[PDB]
Structure formats: C-alpha cells, structure tokens
Amino acid sequence: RPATWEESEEGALSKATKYFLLAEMFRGLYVVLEQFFRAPYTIYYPFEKGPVSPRFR
C-alpha cells in the first residue's frame, strides 16, 4: 500500500526546503554546466571526413 504523509522519514521542513529551493533542478543544471567545459565532437567536413569501412557503398 502507498505510504501516507505521516509515515515518511523526511521532515516537513526538510522536504519543503527541497521544494522551495528547487534541489534536483539545480542538480540537472549543474550537469550541463559540467558539459560546457569539455571537448566537442564536431569534425569539419570538407577538411576532415568521418569513418570508412571497406564494406561501405
């Protein structure tokens, strides 16, 4: 059976701090901020070609 509100380990203050301070939103924000500081994948096409296997047609 799904738990009621009273049988929860989190306090109301602890849960609602995550509510009004947007916790997991900031976590997902920090993910793509980490991605700002890494190496892109783009190759420059008429100067650099992508993969070739000999089987290609």
């Binding site: 992508g50 070739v52 000999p54």
Partner: protein, 68 residues
Amino acid sequence: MSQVEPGWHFWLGYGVDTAPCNTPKEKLPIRAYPYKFQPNYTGTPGAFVTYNTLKPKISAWEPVTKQR
C-alpha cells in the same frame, strides 16, 4: 570534397593506415593506359550527358526504286 584523389580519399576518411605514398608497388594496380582525374563538373558546362550506348532496335528500309 571531389577534388581529392581516389587512393587518398580512402585514407582521409580513415580507411587505410598507410598513405598511398608509402604503399608498396604490389598494391599499386597495373594499368595499360594513362590516368586523368576529372573531379566533378556539376553546373560547369563539362557536366555528364547520358545517351544511347546502342543503335535503335529495329531498322528501316533504305529505298531503292526499280524500272520495270
């Protein structure tokens, strides 16, 4: 991209490790004619035109008259 030579085109695209300067003469194909290298001429007046490689399928009669 069409201006790069065929044996080099496979190397720039990471098909072969050894460039066509450093391949042996065994992997050089033997030919009996000279090489030309036309890149691509689309829009240029030297574009390819297609045509019939063979003559029409059923011939007609070339007329000769006869004095009876």
